[PDB]
From TrEMBL, chain A:
This is RNA-editing complex protein MP81. It comes from the Eukaryota. It comes from Trypanosoma brucei. Transmembrane segments: none annotated.
């Protein structure tokens, strides 16, 4: 399921999961969603095209299933528009 | 609004072991990725080990792989570093750190992206 969104980068992560390095961003749209990328700076206004992932995981403490949604950029792009 | 406090440091002989522990207090709900770092006098602070919020993903600097193990207890708000087969090269002040970046499974591996720091604990390994 594809999504096209506009907003401001509020945070940046250089991270790792499942043997792969990833860059993540917090996009403020006020709500936020994480962008996951497998010239974008803090405070940049961006347009993002990618796949909306609900990304449900079981909470360690409550043992309840929650979504941890993200836009998957692989096909996909994030372009500075500010 | 977050305090990190290390414990478990000290002196050991080469080949020995230590277990470091870090306890998080205050606004712990804001914390996600947790990590251990180290710094020797006159040197830059370096990444040692880090662990995702959910504990599923870990990352280690090359020189500690197979020797150090990071783990966390989200019910106690602690993060721990089991250090086996210690070498003189591991001598440094060790710091625990916490990242506010909101992600369940992805571990932060960039030093400057961590937001809170403990006061540090000295680890010394004699030859
Ligand atoms: Na951060």
């Amino acid at each position: 399921s594809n999504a096209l969104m506009i907003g401001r980068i509020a945070d940046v992560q250089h991270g790792f999961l499942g043997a792969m390095t990833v860059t993540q961003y917090v996009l403020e749209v006020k709500e936020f969603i994480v962008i996951r990328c497998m010239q974008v700076k803090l405070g940049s206004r961006v347009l993002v095209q990618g796949t909306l992932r609900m990304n449900r995981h079981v909470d360690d403490v409550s043992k309840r299933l929650h979504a941890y949604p993200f836009i998957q950029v692989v096909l996909g792009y994030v372009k500075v528009v500010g | 609004q977050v305090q990190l406090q290390e414990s478990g440091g000290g002196l050991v002989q080469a080949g020995g072991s230590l277990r470091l522990s870090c306890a998080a207090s205050g606004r712990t709900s804001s914390l996600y990725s947790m990590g251990w770092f180290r710094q020797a006098p006159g040197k830059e602070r370096e990444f040692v080990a880090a662990i995702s919020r959910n504990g599923a993903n870990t990352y280690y600097t090359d020189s500690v792989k197979g020797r150090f193990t990071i783990s966390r207890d989200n019910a106690k708000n602690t993060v721990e570093l089991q250090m086996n087969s210690l070498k003189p090269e591991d001598t440094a002040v060790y710091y625990c750190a916490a990242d506010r970046f909101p992600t369940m499974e992805v571990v932060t591996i960039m030093t400057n992206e961590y937001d809170y720091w403990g006061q540090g604990t000295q680890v010394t390994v004699s030859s």
